[PDB]
């Protein structure tokens, strides 16, 4: 079980996402089902080491957002053009 | 640091005098003195010598390591004593001692007269062997190297002033 | 002290053992006949290994060893000269009963304890010379 600790995003858009990335954190979205999409911020270091394991993309992962725990699956990753970093992740509510 | 942490054991009848940075180690085989780098704090106590870094000095441990190393060989020096051996290789090469002077025949116009410094003494068991005995490791080394310099072992026959332990790798001359 | 391989009834020519053994300090006539006088029981057309133990007084003492492992696989398969490219070019065939024949003779030299251990150490000398186990 992959446990990803996250936070709901207070800001949205280009400016915020860049500032986030600078601060060694990266934006990600949770969509799927009746429930409205959830804007989350993740730690760049912790998630990056996770995704290194192939199992990250097959298994169902729990994304802890302010107490609540959301079971999701890795949908689409947006990678850095040339650096071994992550720009954004799509999480489909499983 | 691993060198500095390891302690120097002052033996019996070996006096250790420490005046801030200035160390004086007396014994049977003579007396040696040294000025330790400011980054080093030396402690006496018991039949031991311990070294450590002084506060604020960055290179502290690196300095302490060398300090230990040196004092250890000073202790060895004024008790056991160091003995460097050199062998003259090649036709005509001879050597003899005249007190504090090593007279050297090395295939030149003039025979070489090498004056010896304090604490280093020489004796010639053969006309082809020089044995140096002393207390300062840095100095006994210096002197050995100086005498070696007169005729460094040539790579075609091994001819020249070589150290006893020296392994003189020789090579064949150009083919044709 | 040197290692050589001379024939069952031949020990005298100049190109193989001539200036190779006579250069150390071994008699070219005292060894040549003392070696063939004891290898008379050993079959004709089989190279037999021999090691020399020389001292400082030019004297010598030898103990003969069993024929080589790449030597007995040529007479058992039906080949004079081996394959240039082993396991890429097949020169002959040897059964499971012929492997133990070479092994029961080599029992004095082989490191192995069991017959199966001495059989596998001949299986290897067969594969690396083109020959196939059939």
């Amino acid at each position: 079980m992959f446990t990803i600790n996250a936070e709901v995003r207070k800001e949205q858009g280009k400016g915020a996402s860049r500032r986030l990335r600078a601060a060694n954190k990266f934006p990600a979205i949770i969509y799927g089902g009746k429930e409205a999409p959830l804007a989350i911020e993740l730690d760049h270091d912790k998630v990056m080491n996770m995704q290194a394991k192939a199992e990250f993309y097959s298994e169902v992962l729990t994304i802890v957002v302010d107490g609540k725990e959301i079971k999701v699956k890795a949908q689409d990753v947006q990678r850095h053009p040339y650096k071994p970093k992550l720009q954004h992740i799509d999480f489909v509510r499983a | 640091s691993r060198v500095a942490k390891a302690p120097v054991v002052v033996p019996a009848g070996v006096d250790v005098k420490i005046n801030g940075q200035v160390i004086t180690i007396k014994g049977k085989n003579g007396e040696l003195t040294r000025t330790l780098n400011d980054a080093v704090e030396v402690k006496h106590a018991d039949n031991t010598l311990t070294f450590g870094p002084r506060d604020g000095y960055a290179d502290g441990w690196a300095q302490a390591g060398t300090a230990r190393a040196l004092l250890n060989s000073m202790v060895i020096g004024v008790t056991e004593g160091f003995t460097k051996k050199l062998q003259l290789v090649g036709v005509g090469y001879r050597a003899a001692v005249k007190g504090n002077v090593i007279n050297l025949s090395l295939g030149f116009s003039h025979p070489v007269d090498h004056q010896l410094p304090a604490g280093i003494t020489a004796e010639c068991p053969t006309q082809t062997e020089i044995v140096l005995k002393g207390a300062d490791k840095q100095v006994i080394g210096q002197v050995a190297a100086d005498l070696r310099a007169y005729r460094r072992p040539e790579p075609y026959k091994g001819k020249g002033v070589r150290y006893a332990d020296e392994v003189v790798r020789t090579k064949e001359a150009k083919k044709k | 002290y040197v290692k050589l391989q001379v024939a069952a009834g031949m020990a005298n020519p100049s190109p193989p053992v001539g200036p190779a053994l006579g250069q150390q300090g071994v008699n070219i006539m005292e060894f040549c006949k003392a070696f063939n006088a004891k290898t008379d029981s050993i079959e004709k057309g089989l190279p037999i290994p021999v090691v020399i133990t020389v001292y400082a007084d030019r004297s010598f003492t030898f103990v003969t060893k069993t024929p080589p492992a790449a030597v007995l696989l040529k007479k058992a398969a039906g080949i004079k000269s081996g394959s240039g490219k082993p396991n890429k070019d097949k020169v002959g065939k040897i059964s499971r009963a012929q492997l133990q024949e070479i092994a029961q003779t080599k029992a004095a030299d082989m490191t192995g304890a069991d017959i199966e251990a001495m059989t596998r150490s001949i299986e290897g000398t067969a594969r690396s010379m083109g020959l196939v186990v059939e």
Binding site: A54, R79, P81, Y82 | - | -
Partner: protein, 136 residues
């Protein structure tokens, strides 16, 4: 030495090499050589690189060139004054933006894939990173 067989037009306007690459992933092979810098790759360069890495893998395995030199480059010779027309086409390039996978190779151990890419990288005008395939 890679070059378009036919073209709609002979010569091309200079243009610019702004923006980031498209084709940022190992889409065919197991390993890739990706551009970190921004520049022009000439066919003579591409070949020099291709040759060196092909030699490396002892022609075992597969290699794919993700890039193609389709831009024609012109040049005015010596003692030729400005104007009097656009210079003659002399060579061809590929505009490389950071993140372009340039080569992909598979059917070779990672160790060898890294070495083969090390040699090819040497005959190139722009900084390169070694990349491995990924799941999304």
């Amino acid at each position: 030495m890679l070059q378009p067989k036919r073209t709609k037009f002979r010569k091309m306007h200079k243009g610019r090499n702004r923006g980031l690459a498209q084709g940022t992933d190992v889409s065919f092979g197991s390993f890739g050589l990706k551009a970190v810098g921004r520049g022009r790759l000439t066919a003579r360069q591409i070949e020099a690189a291709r040759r060196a890495m092909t030699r490396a893998v002892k022609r075992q395995g597969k290699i794919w060139i993700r890039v193609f030199p389709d831009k024609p480059i012109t040049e005015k010779p010596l003692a030729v004054r400005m104007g009097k027309g656009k210079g003659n086409v002399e060579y061809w390039v590929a505009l490389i933006q950071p993140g372009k996978v340039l080569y992909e190779m598979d059917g070779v151990p990672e160790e060898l894939a890294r070495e083969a890419f090390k040699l090819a990288a040497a005959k190139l005008p722009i900084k390169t990173t070694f990349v491995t395939k990924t799941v999304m």
